[PDB]
Amino acid sequence: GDNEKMAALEAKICHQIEYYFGDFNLPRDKFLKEQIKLDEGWVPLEIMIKFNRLNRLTTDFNVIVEALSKSKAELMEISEDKTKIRRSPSKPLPEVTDEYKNDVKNRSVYIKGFPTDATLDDIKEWLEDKGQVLNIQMRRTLHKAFKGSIFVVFDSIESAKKFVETPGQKYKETDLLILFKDDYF
Template sequence: MSENVAVAEPVKVQDNGVPASTTTTETAAASTAAKSSNVKSDASVLPESSDPAEILKQVEFYFSNENLPNDKFLYKLSLKNEGWVPIATICMFARMKRFRPVSAVVEALRGSKELLEVSEDGELVRRKIPLVEPKKEEKQDAFARSIYAKGFGEETATSQFDIEKFFETFGKFKQVRLRRDNDKKFKSSVFVEFASLEDAEKFLALDPKPKYNDVELLTMSKQAYVDMKAAEHGFTAHASGKNYRKFNAFKDDVHNNKKRRGGDNNNRNRNDNKRRRGPNDRNRERENKDKENKTTEDTQPSTDAAPSTEPATESAPAPAPVETAAEN
């Protein structure tokens, strides 16, 4: 009497080396995992701390004008409850897990003078002043205060933190962004937004150039870098941007829809206007809306798709957003 033995079917492999049975979702997941493995910075290697200054600095960065509009997870979370976000959730972010106990985090956040406020029960935190889209002049000012620096070597688990500490010696800064290629590999270069134009200019004027681990850095203003790359690739600086899959609350419908909802008075005004408009007006509006939607579909990536950059508050490790404006 013979036993039934299951015989494995031979795995069919496509020309690209991927098993034929592999789904698009599985392939995408494998690609995402491979890219994530290229990110070496890991906050879990840092020692546990209850330092209120460190805690406040990190959380204020999360809610800052520079980070919050580009942090899809935290921004959308802040829309759910009048800006309030559970502190317990904040404590689970990659760069916050080392700050314990949670009560120390709550007390540190209560010390925020201008940006943050904590609920009476100590469970929630939010911005004191609602986030608004920066004016053109403010964006230009931030760009002018930003510099490019290259020469930081291979990425290690502490690179993000070591580079931030390095720049602390040259003045206050808003953010340090490690630049990465499309596969999230560190390009050995950073963009740094200083808090003041004076500090940015002082850094760029240093002679000799600053060294990092005994390697002299290549430094220039961010504007000079953009102009240089534009000249190399034969396009104008204003036309050099790619169709980045990067969340931006001010370019996405999330922020605009939130403002459009408004209050009862705004709703009443809109209803009055609708009653005064005739059929032809409404038809023209629908045609214009269709054109706008088509333009948006052609130029804006889906915000529901997996972004090419990891927000600073996503699950560990939490790398800085990818900068893919140029190869080097």
């Protein structure tokens, strides 16, 4: 059903854009920050479609606008003429205080045992039924080769604990080592 397929695509679009403008990417994204200074947070759709994971989903402005209009996250706003988008001023970036960093750390997790040829797509699929994940960091060498270990940030301490305490976890044939970031060094 084409409506059915269009709805699945639009959900993916929302999630991707919401990641780029999110707490775990925006503060470290020089290119996106450049664009956000120029008019009250607004960024043109002609620039957004240059972002590679978004480009692969769609380059149609009409489809992007429809997607964001139906989002349940309430993060993104659309301009009057429908050519530009922004993070809402109701949702500011967190102040990076001791209390914030402690809270994030307590729900961050280290996982080791993925093959070196695994993709971000592969890791996301594996994580699908494991709880709400807000960030995936693939760990790399100096020369950018994947080490086979990751850091992940969960939505809550409750979700992180449920994941860490589950006993027999594997990726395909191989046993994983799973630790709170606090326990890794």
